[PDB]
Design an enzyme around this catalytic site. Structure first.
Site, PDB file in Angstrom:
ATOM      1  NE  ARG A 116      -4.430  -1.101   2.117  1.00  0.00           N
ATOM      2  CZ  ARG A 116      -4.522  -2.411   2.318  1.00  0.00           C
ATOM      3  NH1 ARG A 116      -3.440  -3.124   2.588  1.00  0.00           N
ATOM      4  NH2 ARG A 116      -5.699  -3.011   2.249  1.00  0.00           N
TER       5      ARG A 116
HETATM    6  N1  LIG Z   1      -7.736   3.611  -8.225  1.00  0.00           N
HETATM    7  C1  LIG Z   1      -6.466   2.830  -8.071  1.00  0.00           C
HETATM    8  N2  LIG Z   1      -5.486   2.966  -8.964  1.00  0.00           N
HETATM    9  C2  LIG Z   1      -4.339   2.272  -8.845  1.00  0.00           C
HETATM   10  N3  LIG Z   1      -4.126   1.443  -7.864  1.00  0.00           N
HETATM   11  C3  LIG Z   1      -5.053   1.252  -6.932  1.00  0.00           C
HETATM   12  C4  LIG Z   1      -6.303   1.981  -7.029  1.00  0.00           C
HETATM   13  N4  LIG Z   1      -7.039   1.585  -5.957  1.00  0.00           N
HETATM   14  C5  LIG Z   1      -6.306   0.693  -5.267  1.00  0.00           C
HETATM   15  N5  LIG Z   1      -5.186   0.549  -5.876  1.00  0.00           N
HETATM   16  C6  LIG Z   1      -4.151  -0.340  -5.407  1.00  0.00           C
HETATM   17  O1  LIG Z   1      -4.727  -1.307  -4.420  1.00  0.00           O
HETATM   18  C7  LIG Z   1      -3.988  -0.997  -3.127  1.00  0.00           C
HETATM   19  C8  LIG Z   1      -4.949  -0.949  -2.017  1.00  0.00           C
HETATM   20  O2  LIG Z   1      -5.540   0.341  -1.998  1.00  0.00           O
HETATM   21  P1  LIG Z   1      -6.534   0.745  -0.710  1.00  0.00           P
HETATM   22  O3  LIG Z   1      -7.130   2.152  -0.954  1.00  0.00           O
HETATM   23  O4  LIG Z   1      -5.709   0.759   0.591  1.00  0.00           O
HETATM   24  O5  LIG Z   1      -7.753  -0.370  -0.582  1.00  0.00           O
HETATM   25  P2  LIG Z   1      -8.632  -0.613   0.779  1.00  0.00           P
HETATM   26  O6  LIG Z   1      -9.044   0.710   1.349  1.00  0.00           O
HETATM   27  O7  LIG Z   1      -9.852  -1.403   0.441  1.00  0.00           O
HETATM   28  O8  LIG Z   1      -7.794  -1.382   1.807  1.00  0.00           O
HETATM   29  C9  LIG Z   1      -3.373   0.316  -3.296  1.00  0.00           C
HETATM   30  O9  LIG Z   1      -2.113   0.381  -2.563  1.00  0.00           O
HETATM   31  C10 LIG Z   1      -3.111   0.440  -4.720  1.00  0.00           C
HETATM   32  O10 LIG Z   1      -1.805  -0.140  -5.005  1.00  0.00           O
HETATM   33 MG   LIG Z   2      -8.373   1.437   3.424  1.00  0.00          MG
END
Ligand SMILES: Nc1ncnc2c1ncn2[C@@H]1O[C@H](COP(=O)(O)OP(=O)(O)O)[C@@H](O)[C@H]1O
Ligand SMILES: [Mg+2]
Ligand SMILES: Nc1ncnc2c1ncn2[C@@H]1O[C@H](COP(=O)(O)OP(=O)(O)OP(=O)(O)O)[C@@H](O)[C@H]1O
Ligand SMILES: Nc1ncnc2c1ncn2[C@@H]1O[C@H](COP(=O)(O)OP(=O)(O)O)[C@@H](O)[C@H]1O
Ligand SMILES: [Mg+2]
Ligand SMILES: [Mg+2]
Lengths: 486, 470, 53, 35, 128, 456, 128, 161
Positions: free
Chosen positions: E118
């Site tokens: 992340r």
């Molecule tokens: N819109 C996006 N574009 C590119 N990568 C993304 C996007 N959304 C998520 N990711 C990838 O998936 C990973 C997890 O994102 P995250 O916002 O932390 O999901 P969640 O909130 O559900 O845990 C990110 O670190 C990123 O690498």
């Molecule tokens: Mg999150």
């Protein structure tokens, strides 16, 4: 004003353990000192377990609890039509008090074996798929079961809106008073529903019992029984009512909360031992009375939300066992463009043809047989061009009848127009037309028959059947419009 | 007011015995003789003039017999325009090291939901600039949205892109509530809001109030911080008539927090190990997040779905509280398509032809239908292979893959994840592009021309470049 | 060569469907066992949580 | 169960994905060179 | 200690499944009611209050850091079990190791289609 | 003895007796109620208190309300005056035709017959139905699982069994509607009145109805089966008859037992069922047997939860079933009535040591020819056409017109003896009727009727 | 009584699945913690202490024997269930009766490839 | 019935026969006739010598007829014999345990009666700590070596039990 009282020994999570109250009855309504209401569910040797009709932050240890001496009852009558009420019948739409005269207990027993007659009169929904393949009769308990956001409330609302043609007419035998109990929904969803019913002018013959998500668990528990009593008023007085519990899964959840907090022995999925008893004693009250009892009826349309289509869960199993059939909705059919997304293979109505008019019976027997053969050979699509001519004809007729069942939202059809459309379908007059036009045709043709052919529609509506003159006239109308169709 | 004594400390649950003046349920009690302010919220009256309470901070160092003072009210947090640009915790203390929050009025974090006669039926589409959202499940002004997803599918990135677009296009005092989330993400959001000008440390024209209770907090703080943020937004809605944005991340934690004390409050567990009071707690919380006739609250809630279940009681119970659900899928994120919005599982109550227009509705339904048909054809493709498909079906699969790529979009906040630039596609451009893909107007272009582009003109330009290269 | 591939293909797809039906029966038995075990495990968790009060 | 074979993963879903990608990288090659 | 004195530390918990098991025993013997799989109600809190202490400090606090590498053993690849989902929802990314990849010769058996960071390229040298 | 209600929790009532506690399974009458409320004792809790399950609703009960010990289990009126009536779990008439005037009452809780009272030899109960008698016969005193629900003529089959047993063997029938929907209960009452099985005018009714509805507490639905079984036990032990007992549904009997056990605070067993599942089913089913006086043969409608035959309720019921009758819709679509699936219906006494070598050989030949016909239908030589023709004729001949349907179809009702069934199928198998058309065997009795119909 | 007095007895338990069910009922009514399929923890000891008493005694103790034929009923032919595997871990071999062989007319429906006798081969007569 | 005992007897035949040091076999909750077989087989193979002090194998036995307490402590008895031969003689010991699972199982049977809240699958809450307290004694030290072959029953073929 000398009242028998008790002290609150303890309070928590909406359960009040109360001292005294030696003469309180089981399921008796008591009143707390803060004005809140409660129901005595547990009569124990040293305390009484009261469930609180509200917020327990107003109840403290030591508060005085008075009896009322009465099992829970609700106002009933025609003064409730057009009103939005809570689970106890209090008006929540701000239109003043309910000027009712009669009160009815919410926990009355269902009619016995003898006061009933067979379910024989149709309860028209206005949905082609339901009225043709899963017919509902007056006095039946048809379950609307499906996953989330699959179109169940839309089926209930179409059924409610459709009764305007009968409630505006003069035939008192065919009038249907609707009741929509909303358990565990948002208040804004119920406001949208009430606005939709008002725009369709469907409120003047509809009651909306509203026990929403922020209401206490006892109120959500009690709302279906309040609505059922309001409908039993009509069922007992020679009139016909329809009731929609939307939905019974949330009432089961509320009852499970109340039971688990009262320390009652949990069972499968933590539901108490008498959750089947709950839903069954709620649903056996939808009956069809014989003429010696006024001839009234109450039709129940309970709603159930399944998780991932799992109809083998506890509460779906119970309510499927209790009801007289089911209208199953699928999300895959929803996104395939089949809307209402009714699964005809799984849906069933154990009343069946005894709840259909003779005209709809005529066309619907044929439609059911043809759609069944189509379902049998439907896997052979994606290869249809490489089988017999009979198999290709089965596939063609099946897809034509499938597109014939699609229907718009909030637009219920009269039974005569449904019969005319299914006639054009199952008689072969859509085989030469290609599928992508069927719906369009179904619209235009409809307008045609509505504009220049009121005589045939009126004669079918008055006879209930397609006689030979009606049959031939329908034949000529269909072939003429089809030949002159773009 | 009244004084009692601690008689039991088990985990995050504390029993207090009052000799005189038992406090009502939901009152906030202050423990006497502690360095930092510890607050206990009354949850039950146990009888014998003893109350069970949930601790808002740690219970270490508590002694039986330690004095507890009744405040006479629930947790009261400061409300007003002075909270804008500040960070407060569950009990309203400023946790940004910027000094006290000198408001002129305090509001209790426990209040009643708006009545039924206070509801507003107005449904007006809120254009976000995201292709899949606006196309298939558009958000409405004053509605509750909800973003469902498992761990790592993109809930935070999507909620931050929504913050970016809407909140910077908005003029109505946004409010962010971090509920049991990572503190690293809280610091990240704080600083990317300072550097964006949305929070101003001088010349106080800040337009966002932050409320934070993170993963390291006890269950009580993580269960009440959502109510704290809700109360800030509620003051902004009622006593000022403004139109508020309310971002909540993550709301599942709220639910989860309850579970972590349920059995310690003496309650038989329900199914999947959740409190027996799950649905009613979620109800009394969510029914306050609503648009009334006195003001408007648009709420975006990130909803964690444990193990990609969507049938777990927490997400399944949340589903009925939202107006436009956006469900993120891992099967879609593993294709490389972002955002991972599931087109065949997202829903919006304004996806109605009488609301979005017949063209928008027809395009959305055609997209969903061709994607479902692609799903149905993939089985035949696995068995027969691709070369033995009908030509209509090869066309279906081509257009379906192109639509899949075109639903993807590069985000301004994901510029580090992708290296691409952010694109904000208008609504008419989205409808027009998807109509043109469905009509066959781009059968000649490759499918990688639609991956991570904005409007369809960018797809055409990308195809021309991809050809000019090879 | 045709009438040799149109019968060999028929036989091959027949055997494929037979094997698929056999695997479906085995997997249905496994599924029923697993869902019964899941219901029982959830029941035992609820009962053990309630007996600790 | 419309995408049941490729939602389950496994050999029959990983071969379907490979076949799709093969066909469409072929078509994207024979579509780009014709531009 | 190192994190608050301008130094950089790295900690490995090998593993947290066994700590959760020890905590479950300790709680069941204190007669605290069992939750899912007899684990106490606050096992998520147990791991989150621990993994939240791994942080990167600003230069007003020394600039030190603490990096956490928790380890979780799954049963037959069930990353849908309680404790694995808890710790997956807590951390900033996962390195997924699989047995099928381990025996196919992929060593270390890192499943890249499932491994997430992340933080991403922000935690990386420019050449790499 | 008189006690007082000390606790009311749902359908569970704790009653305290200052003297003379009632034994377990006794019936207690709650005093001061508009309608009769019966409590069945289930435990002795200590301190002169007993826990009881209620047979009706418990709303409006007051702590301290007087309760009267009856000194016996639930007693119901038994005798011929129960024939044609409807009673509930406590023996009350619910058809509004006045009191059931019998000379004797019987407790619904009795013991299975002793080991020395059992009939040591299995024998066939001849039903006069060709497919049943031939392919999956009914043992006299056994349990028959009736599979298949709506739209396959289950009610017509039940009424035909009642009528055939009354005519041939001279024995009456009982119908226990456990968990019966009130709508379908009314429908069945009137279907039986129309088809002549129940007679509201004279004393020639053939069946006694015992209904426990779905809106009754779990205790009533748990004991309604024992009530019907007590009526049947009277007809067997005192009249020396060959009684039929229908139980619909048996899965609802199991579910009512499960709910009652969960209400009493017992730890659930596997899949949520009562820990006493097998012994509940055993103490019920062991009373349906052949004694030295008569016999009770039970047809029990089976429901399989989630279509899993290894579920504890079906798997516990199947341990007692001596036969299986599968009503299939595919057979009904072919116009064949009854819709008894001839290849899926099984019987444990289909064994040359019980039914005879000739009966067994004929049945095995019929089964083999039907299997061969379906294997030939799979693909569609020299004799494959002969097997196709003979199997078509066998299929048509398994059908039969029922007496209870004479007012609908107009045809006469055939009660085929067992020898005639064996002989007809023997002759069809041995090729004695390859000249008659296949439509000559449809809806006839013995084979003589088939040749007389082919004469036309 | 025969095993200890120089005589030879055979004993059939028909069947031990129903004894296990009865013991599970007695255990659940005593409020004892259920295990796999809600069976008590000592449902193995239940059958082990019973089937260990079938023994062959040497000539110093009389020379008598007690042969046991415990019967077990499986569900859908699943012999990897709890009670079947318990009794397989107790006894000296098994005789698998298959339903597919019973329906096909092969009777006794012994699965000769899965039926084993560990200690009986040294007891076969010479001609056999 | 998959071959744990055949394999442990093959390991006794291959490794323990030609072994240099001593050897201990602890039968924990297994068949008594298997213990009789092993005893008479070790006698007829000369490994146990009933006439002098040339025997090389000790035998401890609490089998599946014994109450749960004996089945819980007999593995500890075998451990104690092996620990003496390791610490107090510096010998290289072989320790064969069959079945070690029974140890755990026996604990379950008493955990109910000791008044402890059950854990998952109805197991003692102290399962891992009891197993560790037993297993850490089964080890090699720098005072002597112990090679330990333990047969582990897998209930209902569930490897995640
Ligand atoms: N819109 C996006 N574009 C590119 N990568 C993304 C996007 N959304 C998520 N990711 C990838 O998936 C990973 C997890 O994102 P995250 O916002 O932390 O999901 P969640 O909130 O559900 O845990 C990110 O670190 C990123 O690498
Ligand atoms: Mg999150
Ligand atoms: N016949 C139809 N044609 C087009 N759209 C429809 C139709 N029926 C329903 N819909 C749409 O599908 C969506 C879901 O339908 P609906 O809300 O009535 O079902 P539901 O099961 O009650 O959903 P919920 O889970 O919120 O209770 C709605 O937005 C509705 O507008
Ligand atoms: N190496 C082997 N060779 C041949 N048969 C074997 C072998 N191992 C096991 N078996 C068979 O499996 C059966 C079980 O052996 P055993 O080791 O006693 O089972 P358990 O796993 O319960 O200890 C043996 O009787 C034998 O028939
Ligand atoms: Mg709805
Ligand atoms: Mg062994």
């Amino acid at each position: 004003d000398l009242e028998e009282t008790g002290r609150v020994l303890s309070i928590g999570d909406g359960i009040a353990r109360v001292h005294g109250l030696r003469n309180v009855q089981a399921e008796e309504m008591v009143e707390f000192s803060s004005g809140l209401k409660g129901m005595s569910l547990n009569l124990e040797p040293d305390n009484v377990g009261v469930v609180v009709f509200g917020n327990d932050k107003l109840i403290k240890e030591g508060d005085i609890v008075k009896r009322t001496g009465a099992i829970v009852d609700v106002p009933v009558g025609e003064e409730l039509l057009g009103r939005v009420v809570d689970a106890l019948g209090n008006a929540i739409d701000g239109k003043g008090p309910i000027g009712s005269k009669t009160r009815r207990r919410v926990g009355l027993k269902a009619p016995g074996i003898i006061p009933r007659i067979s379910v024989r009169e149709p309860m028209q929904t206005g949905i082609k798929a339901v009225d043709s393949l899963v017919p509902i009769g007056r006095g039946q308990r048809e379950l609307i079961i499906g996953d989330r956001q699959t179109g169940k409330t839309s089926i209930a609302i179409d059924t409610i809106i459709n009764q305007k043609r009968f409630n505006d007419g003069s035939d008192e035998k065919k009038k249907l008073y609707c009741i929509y109990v909303a358990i565990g929904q948002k208040r804004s969803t119920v406001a949208q529903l009430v606005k939709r019913l008002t725009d369709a002018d469907a409120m003047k013959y509809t009651i909306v019992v509203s026990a929403t998500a922020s209401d206490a668990a006892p109120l959500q528990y009690l709302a279906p029984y309040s609505g059922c009593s309001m409908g039993e008023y009509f069922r007992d007085n020679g009139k016909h009512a329809l009731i929609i519990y939307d939905d019974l899964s949330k009432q089961a959840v509320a009852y499970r909360q109340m039971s688990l907090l009262l320390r009652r022995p949990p069972g499968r999925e933590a539901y108490p031992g008498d959750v089947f008893y709950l839903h069954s004693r709620l649903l056996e009250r939808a009956a069809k009375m014989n003429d010696a009892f006024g001839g009234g009826s109450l039709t129940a349309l309970p709603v159930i939300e399944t998780q991932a289509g799992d109809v083998s869960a506890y509460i779906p199993t119970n309510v499927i066992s209790i009801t007289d059939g089911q209208i199953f909705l699928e999300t895959e059919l929803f996104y395939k463009g089949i809307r209402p997304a009714i699964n005809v293979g799984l849906s069933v109505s154990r009343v069946g043809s005894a709840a259909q008019t003779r005209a709809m019976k005529q066309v619907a027997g044929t439609m059911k047989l043809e759609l069944a053969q189509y379902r049998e050979v439907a896997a052979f699509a994606q290869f249809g061009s490489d089988l017999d001519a009979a198999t290709q004809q089965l596939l063609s007729r099946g897809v034509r009848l499938t597109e014939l069942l699609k229907q718009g939202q909030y637009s219920p059809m009269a039974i005569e127009e449904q019969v005319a459309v299914i006639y054009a379908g199952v008689r072969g007059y859509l085989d030469k037309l290609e599928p992508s036009k069927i719906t369009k045709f179904e619209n235009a043709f409809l307008s045609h028959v509505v504009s220049q052919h009121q005589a045939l529609l009126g004669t079918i509506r008055a006879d209930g059947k397609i006689s030979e003159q009606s049959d031939a006239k329908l034949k000529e109308i269909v072939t003429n419009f089809l030949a002159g169709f773009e | 007011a009244a004084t009692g004594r601690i008689v039991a400390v088990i985990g995050a649950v504390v029993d207090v015995q009052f000799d005189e003046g038992l406090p009502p349920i939901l009152n906030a009690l202050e423990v006497q003789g502690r360095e930092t302010r510890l607050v206990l919220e009354v949850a039950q009256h146990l009888g014998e003039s003893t109350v069970r309470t949930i601790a808002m901070d740690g219970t270490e160092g508590l002694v039986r017999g330690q004095k507890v003072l009744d405040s006479g009210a629930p947790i009261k947090i400061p409300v007003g325009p002075e909270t804008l640009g500040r960070i407060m915790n569950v009990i309203g203390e400023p946790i940004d090291e910027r000094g006290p929050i000198k408001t002129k009025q305090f509001a209790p974090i426990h209040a009643e939901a708006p009545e039924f006669m206070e509801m507003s039926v107005e449904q007006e589409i809120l254009v976000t600039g995201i292709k899949v959202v606006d196309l298939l499940a558009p958000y409405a002004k004053g509605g509750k949205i909800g973003l469902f997803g498992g761990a790592g599918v993109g809930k935070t990135v999507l909620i931050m892109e929504l913050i970016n677009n809407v909140a910077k296009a908005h003029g109505g005092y946004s409010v962010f509530a971090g509920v049991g989330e990572r503190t690293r993400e809280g610091n990240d959001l704080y600083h990317e809001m300072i550097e964006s000008g949305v929070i101003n440390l001088k010349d106080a024209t800040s337009k966002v109030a932050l409320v934070y209770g993170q993963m390291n907090e006890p269950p009580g703080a993580r269960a009440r911080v959502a109510l704290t943020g809700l109360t800030v937004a509620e003051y902004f809605r009622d006593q000022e008539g403004q139109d508020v944005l309310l971002f909540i991340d993550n709301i599942f934690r709220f639910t989860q927090a309850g579970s972590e004390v349920s059995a310690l409050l003496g309650r038989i567990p329900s199914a999947v190990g959740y409190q027996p009071t799950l649905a009613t707690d979620m109800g009394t919380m969510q029914e306050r997040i609503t648009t009334t006739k006195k003001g408007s609250i648009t709420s975006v809630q990130a909803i964690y779905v444990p193990a990609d279940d969507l049938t777990d009681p927490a997400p399944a119970t949340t589903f009925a509280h939202l107006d436009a659900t956006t469900v993120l899928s891992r099967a879609i994120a593993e294709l490389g398509i972002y955002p991972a919005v599931d087109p065949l599982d997202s829903t919006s109550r304004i996806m109605d032809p009488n609301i979005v227009g017949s063209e928008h509705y027809d395009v959305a339904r055609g997209v969903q239908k061709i994607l479902q048909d692609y799903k149905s054809l993939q089985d035949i493709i696995a068995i027969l292979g691709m070369d033995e498909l009908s030509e209509e079906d090869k066309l279906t699969v081509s257009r379906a893959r192109k639509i899949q790529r075109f639903l993807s979009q590069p985000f301004q906040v994901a510029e580090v994840f992708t290296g691409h630039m952010g694109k904000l596609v208008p609504l008419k451009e989205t409808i027009k592009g998807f109509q043109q893909i469905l009509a066959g107007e781009y059968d000649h272009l490759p499918e990688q021309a639609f991956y991570m582009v904005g409007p369809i003109e960018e797809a055409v330009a990308k195809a021309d470049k991809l050809a000019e290269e090879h | 060569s045709t009438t040799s591939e149109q019968s060999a293909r028929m036989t091959a797809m027949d055997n494929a469907s037979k094997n698929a039906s056999e695997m479906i029966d085995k997997l249905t038995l496994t599924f029923n066992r697993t869902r019964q075990a899941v219901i029982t495990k959830e029941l035992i968790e609820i009962i053990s949580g309630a007996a600790a009060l | 169960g419309a995408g049941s074979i490729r939602e389950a993963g496994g050999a029959f879903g990983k071969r379907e994905q490979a076949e799709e990608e093969r066909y469409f990288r072929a078509q994207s090659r024979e579509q780009l060179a014709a531009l």
